[PDB]
């Protein structure tokens, strides 16, 4: 319907036949038609836990928050960054009462509430400090936990145990009982992973011979097994037997971090290749599902310990929230689907969401950005 005067579009419109010329391209378009009949390859074909928008914006960090963590009670959040100043924010009020500064690569609170000791690792040194905000009995109980890596025993800077490692610590983990501390340093080759026992006040390397860099490390939440996320794969070692358990290949160029549910069967791992892989130990070594939501490198992924939800943070500034129900039945496969896609986060130096923390009680996500802004998506 392109002709004299069609209202379809206004090619060209012509008032009458006289103004209508001869088409010059007709012989050409027919010439290509010929080519069709013997040159065109004739291939035949068949023709709901609501983590709502963040309403609390915590500010005060002069720089990017390297890592953020929530205490056992969940009412206090401790974060550290390259600025060297540690800020503790109250969940209920958002206050920065504990603003003592005392580059913290990571900060984690002890699994035991009766021993509220937060271990903050700056470069190659990690200090287990008991803040005065916690109860005196809790502080006293934390000191009794401790009082390869050299161990040594300021605006309320109550330092209990300081541990120095051969390499700069990148990933820090604490045992369920709190007597073991796992330090992962990708820089080191022979002693990349170090295991420190607080009861004996010493540290050692569980691996007799270490080859390859390790990007993340964690312990199983059900059995005495340690999972170390290397650059390419993740190896699970039974610390009781000091032997391997299972090796899961993420199928990515460089793994970023790993997260595990409380059951210890289904895990979600983030990679630097903008990949989010959900793997189940009872399904296969290969991931059960894969995701590439992030437009930039997938920084980290977090699964809520209680709520059946998981969150993934990336440098793209977009955080993906998914709800996943896991059933113990053999025939009931884990049903995981996305729930929300957080946005409206500032990106600086191609870095967006860096650290994401889930509330110990509800499905509330605490995300700290490169600008020192913490968004609490309740």
């Amino acid at each position: 319907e392109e002709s004299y005067n069609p209202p379809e579009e206004y090619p060209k419109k012509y008032k009458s036949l006289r103004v209508v010329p001869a088409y010059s391209n007709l012989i050409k378009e027919k010439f290509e038609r010929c080519l069709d009949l013997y040159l065109a390859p004739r291939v035949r074909r068949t023709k709901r836990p609501f983590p709502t928008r963040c309403t609390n914006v915590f500010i005060g960090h002069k720089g990017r928050v390297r890592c953020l963590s929530v205490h056992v009670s969940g009412n206090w959040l401790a974060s550290g960054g390259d600025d060297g100043v540690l800020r503790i924010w109250e969940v209920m009020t958002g206050r920065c009462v504990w603003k003592c500064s005392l580059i913290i690569q990571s900060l984690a609170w002890g699994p035991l509430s009766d021993s509220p000791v937060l271990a903050v690792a700056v470069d190659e040194t990690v200090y287990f400090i008991t803040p005065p905000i916690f109860s005196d009995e809790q502080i006293e109980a934390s000191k009794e936990l401790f009082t390869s890596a050299i161990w040594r025993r300021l605006h309320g800077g109550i330092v209990h145990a300081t541990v120095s490692t051969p390499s700069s610590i990148k990933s820090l983990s604490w045992h369920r009982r709190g007597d073991y501390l796992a330090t992962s340093s990708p820089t080191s080759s022979s002693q990349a992973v170090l295991i420190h026992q607080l009861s004996r006040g010493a540290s050692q390397s569980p691996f007799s011979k270490s080859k390859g860099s390790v990007q993340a490390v964690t312990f199983h939440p059900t059995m005495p097994y340690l999972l170390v996320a290397t650059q390419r794969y993740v190896r699970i070692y039974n610390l009781v037997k000091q032997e391997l358990v299972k090796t899961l290949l993420t199928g990515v160029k460089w793994v970023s971090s790993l997260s595990v549910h409380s059951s210890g069967d289904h895990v979600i791992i983030g990679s630097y290749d903008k990949r989010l892989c959900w793997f189940d130990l009872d399904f296969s070594s290969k991931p059960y599902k894969n995701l590439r939501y992030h437009s930039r490198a997938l920084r980290d992924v977090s699964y809520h310990p209680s709520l059946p939800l998981f969150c993934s943070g990336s440098d793209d500034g977009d955080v993906q929230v998914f709800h996943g129900r896991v059933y113990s039945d053999l025939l009931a496969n884990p049903l995981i689907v996305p729930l929300k896609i957080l946005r409206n986060h500032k990106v600086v130096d191609n870095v967006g969401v860096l650290s994401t923390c889930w509330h110990p009680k509800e499905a509330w996500l605490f995300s700290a950005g490169a600008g020192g802004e913490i968004r609490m998506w309740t």
Partner: protein
């Protein structure tokens, strides 16, 4: 800004320019390291007879930013400096792959502009061996 060549690793025989020198030593690299951005895929010889999309595809170049030791590198008399090539090299870009990816994208864009302008022809052209 000094042009350097890598004689070791996967990026063997690739010319690089020192965006930030780490020869003073670092915990990650206890040696005379150097974080430099080079060219892995040299642009193809674009012909004026080719189409605009064809010319850009041939002229496309794949950059590569990596840290290598001084011993693994080789200094050269030639040198090229760019305004966008100063201050963009840091450990944060190396630490964050997304920052590294943006750094690689920016470096390739600068190199493509350099190739389009006809500058750094010797560096742009891959070296034979």
């Amino acid at each position: 800004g000094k042009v350097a060549l890598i004689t070791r690793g996967r990026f063997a025989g690739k010319k690089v320019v020192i965006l930030q020198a780490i020869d003073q030593g670092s915990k990650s690299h206890p040696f005379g390291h150097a974080v430099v951005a080079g060219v892995e895929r040299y642009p193809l010889k674009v012909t004026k007879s080719m189409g605009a999309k064809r010319i850009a595809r041939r002229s496309r170049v794949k950059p590569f930013i990596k840290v290598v030791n001084y011993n693994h590198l080789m200094p050269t008399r030639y040198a090229l400096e760019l305004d966008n090539l100063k201050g963009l090299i840091t450990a944060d870009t190396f630490k964050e792959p997304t920052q590294r990816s943006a750094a690689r994208k920016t470096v390739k864009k600068t190199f493509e502009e350099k190739y389009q302008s006809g500058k750094s022809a010797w560096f742009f052209t891959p070296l034979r061996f």
